[PDB]
Design an enzyme around this catalytic site. Structure first.
Site, short mmCIF file in Angstrom:
data_model
loop_
_atom_site.label_atom_id
_atom_site.label_comp_id
_atom_site.label_asym_id
_atom_site.label_seq_id
_atom_site.Cartn_x
_atom_site.Cartn_y
_atom_site.Cartn_z
N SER B 21 -7.13 -9.09 -1.89
CA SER B 21 -6.32 -8.24 -2.76
C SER B 21 -6.61 -6.78 -2.43
O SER B 21 -7.76 -6.44 -2.15
CB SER B 21 -6.66 -8.53 -4.25
OG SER B 21 -5.69 -7.97 -5.14
N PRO B 22 -5.61 -5.90 -2.60
CA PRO B 22 -5.83 -4.47 -2.35
C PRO B 22 -6.84 -3.84 -3.33
O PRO B 22 -6.68 -4.00 -4.54
CB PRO B 22 -4.44 -3.83 -2.57
CG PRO B 22 -3.61 -4.85 -3.31
CD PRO B 22 -4.22 -6.21 -3.01
N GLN B 99 -0.92 -2.00 1.21
CA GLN B 99 -0.17 -1.67 0.01
C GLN B 99 0.27 -0.18 -0.02
O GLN B 99 -0.56 0.73 -0.09
CB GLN B 99 -1.01 -2.00 -1.21
CG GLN B 99 -0.26 -1.94 -2.51
CD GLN B 99 -1.20 -1.98 -3.71
OE1 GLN B 99 -2.15 -1.24 -3.75
NE2 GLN B 99 -1.04 -2.98 -4.57
N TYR B 176 1.38 2.81 -12.42
CA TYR B 176 1.70 3.79 -11.39
C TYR B 176 3.22 3.94 -11.23
O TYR B 176 3.98 3.34 -11.98
CB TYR B 176 0.97 3.44 -10.09
CG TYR B 176 -0.55 3.36 -10.29
CD1 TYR B 176 -1.26 4.44 -10.81
CD2 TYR B 176 -1.26 2.20 -9.99
CE1 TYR B 176 -2.65 4.37 -11.00
CE2 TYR B 176 -2.65 2.11 -10.21
CZ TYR B 176 -3.34 3.19 -10.72
OH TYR B 176 -4.71 3.12 -10.90
N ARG B 224 3.99 -6.03 -5.56
CA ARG B 224 3.13 -6.26 -6.70
C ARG B 224 3.77 -5.72 -7.99
O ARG B 224 4.21 -4.57 -8.05
CB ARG B 224 1.76 -5.58 -6.52
CG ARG B 224 0.77 -5.99 -7.62
CD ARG B 224 -0.65 -5.53 -7.31
NE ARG B 224 -1.36 -6.58 -6.60
CZ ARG B 224 -2.68 -6.71 -6.58
NH1 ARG B 224 -3.45 -5.80 -7.19
NH2 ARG B 224 -3.21 -7.81 -6.05
N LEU B 295 -9.46 -12.81 -11.55
CA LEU B 295 -10.64 -13.63 -11.87
C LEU B 295 -10.50 -15.02 -11.27
O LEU B 295 -10.79 -16.01 -11.94
CB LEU B 295 -10.83 -13.75 -13.38
CG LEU B 295 -11.24 -12.46 -14.11
CD1 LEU B 295 -10.95 -12.50 -15.63
CD2 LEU B 295 -12.73 -12.16 -13.85
N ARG B 318 -12.54 -8.92 -6.60
CA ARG B 318 -13.95 -8.64 -6.84
C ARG B 318 -14.94 -9.64 -6.20
O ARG B 318 -16.06 -9.27 -5.87
CB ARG B 318 -14.20 -8.53 -8.35
CG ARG B 318 -13.74 -7.17 -8.93
CD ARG B 318 -13.69 -7.17 -10.46
NE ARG B 318 -12.58 -7.96 -10.98
CZ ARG B 318 -12.39 -8.25 -12.26
NH1 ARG B 318 -13.23 -7.78 -13.18
NH2 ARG B 318 -11.38 -9.02 -12.62
C1 FMN Z 1 -12.39 -1.27 -7.27
C2 FMN Z 1 -11.02 -1.86 -7.48
C3 FMN Z 1 -9.94 -1.32 -6.79
C4 FMN Z 1 -8.65 -1.80 -7.02
N1 FMN Z 1 -7.60 -1.26 -6.33
C5 FMN Z 1 -6.33 -1.79 -6.45
C6 FMN Z 1 -5.32 -1.31 -5.63
O1 FMN Z 1 -5.58 -0.57 -4.67
N2 FMN Z 1 -4.06 -1.84 -5.74
C7 FMN Z 1 -3.85 -2.85 -6.64
O2 FMN Z 1 -2.72 -3.27 -6.82
N3 FMN Z 1 -4.85 -3.31 -7.44
C8 FMN Z 1 -6.12 -2.87 -7.29
N4 FMN Z 1 -7.16 -3.41 -8.04
C9 FMN Z 1 -7.03 -4.73 -8.73
C10 FMN Z 1 -7.39 -5.90 -7.79
O3 FMN Z 1 -6.65 -5.81 -6.58
C11 FMN Z 1 -7.12 -7.24 -8.46
O4 FMN Z 1 -5.73 -7.39 -8.74
C12 FMN Z 1 -7.91 -7.35 -9.77
O5 FMN Z 1 -9.18 -6.74 -9.61
C13 FMN Z 1 -8.05 -8.79 -10.27
O6 FMN Z 1 -8.44 -9.68 -9.24
P1 FMN Z 1 -10.01 -10.08 -9.10
O7 FMN Z 1 -10.41 -10.70 -10.40
O8 FMN Z 1 -10.14 -11.14 -8.02
O9 FMN Z 1 -10.87 -8.89 -8.83
C14 FMN Z 1 -8.44 -2.90 -7.86
C15 FMN Z 1 -9.52 -3.45 -8.53
C16 FMN Z 1 -10.80 -2.94 -8.37
C17 FMN Z 1 -11.94 -3.85 -8.78
#
Ligand code: FMN
Ligand code: FMN
Lengths: 348, 348
Positions: B21-22, B99, B176, B224, B295, B318
């Site tokens: 994921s971004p 992205q 955004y 997204r 998650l 994460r």
């Molecule tokens: C440090 C950080 C940076 C993130 N940057 C972006 C981003 O650049 N673009 C985006 O759409 N979501 C971003 N997110 C959200 C994650 O891409 C993801 O959708 C979200 O953290 C939930 O997934 P996860 O539980 O596996 O972390 C970011 C999240 C964190 C933790």
């Protein structure tokens, strides 16, 4: 949590008690230079949390290589790549160390995924005895040969310090050159460098000493040994005790306790911490600091051998190849808050 | 295991169904250039086994940034850096995606670990409604400004393709720019771009349409979205379904289903897989492929949502910050012999 308590060695303080064990990558250039592979591989495990990285076996002469793609340090032209690799290690937050190595009678095999077969090099040895079937007969070193190789180790340390490595390890394990002098399975000399325990220790002890003279006391000198070769009448834990006291007298800082590798056809009773007894004995009976290594994979297990006084330092290999961030996640599991890159705070 | 079966998207074949994921790293130069941080951070995860890396939100215009250290893509001078990144990701075995982003009314705040305060930029948005207290009032876009931003996305996407990126994601999530046009907690315009659902989707669809035109069919375009804003009277799953149908008509390949971001004072029922019902609804009711995220931490969990038809693609954020090699170790947990670098075979 002792695993994540600082550890004073020489004039250093390791921020914790996890080290990355040396692991050959077979990814250098043919002239033994550091490539992009290492510049990604090692700083990854440094961001991962280990306090100390020991860079894989690094040949102190071209004929001491395992493979044609081993890291080398026989040349001043190795300095720029090595200096860059230690620098990225330190910048990602670990202490850079390096293992100096000479592969003796096991020199000259293909990368393991390209077959791992002997290449037919003039390998050198204590005794004209092949490692196993298919291997070349090593030619047995005269004294000038030994002295050449001792100098190569001495100049390899000088060059590693100039590259900015802060911990040097001498590889004297796994059936490679100095380990093969130790064991009577590979060493049947009848001059001053074979036969008795004292004689078989002679040349390896000369090397540690001459390397110790060129590494100031502030920087730790490790020696890795095979604490036993697992062979009937082979090198044993008691021998390892004797060798340990002599290293301690010479001023070696820490014995890194592995085993096996001298010959193939022996029974190895592999299990989580099967080499931990060897660290524990040296440490408690000789009073030389030890590194434990060998199927250590769990934070509770690393903590526990520490609590028990079985070692001062825990070395990890394989768990770090498949899980380079193990140490950041291990801390949390012991109830310690991990220091992580700010970028990554939200992952913890 | 579906998790490790290939996925065809457009003209290309992702080697498995896991994607990074971004995630903003806030580690570019002040001018938005790739640095050594990214060239380590991204290839580590590629070696670690994902089929697809989506590079973090990369702003199509300088005021489109979150932080002053966001990646940018508004200039040709970004091209050598972006190109080296996409190259190294590919060379470590993943398909490189990026992205494209514009932070809108949430634009210009400090790095998280430096406080994350607003910085006083002339941020823009659909309506003069601050994100929260502390934050500038955004300037409402006019048609000209919307056309300008539309064309920065287009040149953004063109630049990304010339850099070697093979998947382009449009960031229309998280409060955004394009997401603030979708939600009525942030869009109260009284022209053709606010009020009704049709109006509110109007700008975001124009961008998706204009990007689709310069991205060859062979190469997948993602979007997204925040599938709900979790706000009373806010953007809803039903809205998402209608947006998804339109996106699908335009030839968008996959909906990446997140949630939240538009305003702050709402309760989000976090739990493993909490955004998975959003991906599931779109995919089964609209027929548009979806990416699931939120998650997801576990091989059995990721496999099960695929078996269920809940999504075509599993995105991990994460867990990849704390365990970059999760996917190699996840194959094995699932009965699959992982493809791992030859250097690492003995770790597995
Ligand atoms: C440090 C950080 C940076 C993130 N940057 C972006 C981003 O650049 N673009 C985006 O759409 N979501 C971003 N997110 C959200 C994650 O891409 C993801 O959708 C979200 O953290 C939930 O997934 P996860 O539980 O596996 O972390 C970011 C999240 C964190 C933790
Ligand atoms: C791929 C690979 C390369 C290794 N190269 C070396 C080496 O360069 N020098 C050394 O002393 N041991 C080497 N070893 C042994 C490891 O350092 C370590 O002592 C051994 O794997 C036991 O620890 P582990 O179970 O934590 O992996 C290597 C092991 C592997 C798997």
């Amino acid at each position: 949590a002792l695993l994540f308590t600082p550890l004073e060695l020489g004039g250093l303080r390791l921020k914790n008690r996890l080290a990355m064990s040396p692991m050959c990558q077979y990814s250098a250039t043919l002239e033994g230079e550091v490539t992009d592979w290492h510049l990604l591989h090692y700083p990854t495990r440094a961001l991962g949390g280990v306090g100390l990285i020991l860079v894989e076996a690094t040949a102190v002469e071209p004929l001491g290589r395992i493979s044609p793609y081993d890291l080398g340090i026989w040349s001043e032209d190795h300095l720029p790549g090595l200096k860059e690799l230690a620098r990225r290690i330190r910048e990602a937050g670990a202490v850079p160390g390096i293992q100096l190595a000479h592969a003796g009678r096991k020199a000259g095999t293909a990368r393991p995924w390209e077959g791992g077969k002997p290449l037919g090099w003039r390998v050198v040895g204590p005794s004209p005895i092949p490692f196993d079937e298919g291997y070349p007969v090593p030619e047995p070193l005269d004294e000038a040969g030994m002295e050449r190789i001792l100098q190569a180790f001495v100049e390899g340390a000088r060059r590693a310090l100039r590259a900015g490595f802060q911990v040097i390890e001498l590889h004297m394990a796994h059936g490679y050159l100095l380990s093969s002098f130790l064991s009577p399975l590979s060493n049947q000399r009848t001059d001053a460098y074979g036969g008795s325990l004292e004689n078989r220790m002679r040349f390896p002890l000369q090397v540690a000493q001459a390397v110790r003279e060129v590494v100031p006391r502030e920087l730790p000198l490790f020696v890795r040994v095979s604490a036993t070769d697992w062979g009937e009448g082979g090198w044993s834990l008691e021998d390892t005790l004797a060798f340990a006291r002599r290293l301690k007298e010479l001023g070696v800082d820490l014995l890194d306790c592995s085993s096996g590798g001298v010959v193939l056809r022996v029974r190895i009773p592999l299990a989580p911490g099967f080499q931990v007894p060897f660290a524990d004995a040296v440490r408690k009976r000789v009073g030389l600091r030890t590194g434990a290594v060998g199927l250590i994979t769990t934070p509770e297990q690393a903590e526990t051998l520490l609590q028990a006084g079985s070692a001062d330092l825990v070395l990890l290999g394989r768990v770090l190849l498949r899980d380079p961030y193990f140490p950041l996640r291990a801390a949390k599991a012991l109830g310690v808050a991990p220091e992580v890159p700010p970028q990554y705070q939200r992952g913890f």
